Amino acid sequence: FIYEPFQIPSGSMMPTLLIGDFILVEKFAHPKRGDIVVFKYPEDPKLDYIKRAVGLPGDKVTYDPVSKELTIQPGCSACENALPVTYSNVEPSDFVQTFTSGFFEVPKNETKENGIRLSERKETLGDVTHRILTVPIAQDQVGMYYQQPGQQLATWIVPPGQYFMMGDNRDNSADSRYWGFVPEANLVGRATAIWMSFDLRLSRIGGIH
């Protein structure tokens, strides 16, 4: 297995990956659902993106922008079956976002002026659980989504050999919702570890949770 280091400059994967993390990526030789995947950006392959592989080839992906919850129906290209997906109670996150924008780690009992407290919950997609963050005052403008020809707004059927990527910082992630699918050829590898974290956040070094 070949391993490539990457730095995380954006908050698109909060709280799983924070700005200032240096990660290791294990290059492929296929990603499973829920994998944190680094890939070459389709519109501009000179740029590398990191998102969660939320949709696999053949998946019917539906996103409710109000509840900010996903519905997945696998192997459907009159669908056959539905993937077990669960959501935990929404609770305050450790983070406050200011409104341009920036992220701060504020104590849950404290408040930051000109800021909004982000919400946190656990999303389970079949076998894998991870956290997502949501901005309580934000909601996607479905009209800005990438619309798949033949499909309704906010529903996508993942073509064979391609993937649907979504960030964990749900309201702060330029992902498959806006720019479409990620082709197999574009996949770089799977994120495995945090080798180093600058603000030094040595407590972050280890596995990805």
Place this chain on the structure above:
Amino acid sequence: XXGXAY
């Protein structure tokens, strides 16, 4: 290495 990932 040390490239970025957005």
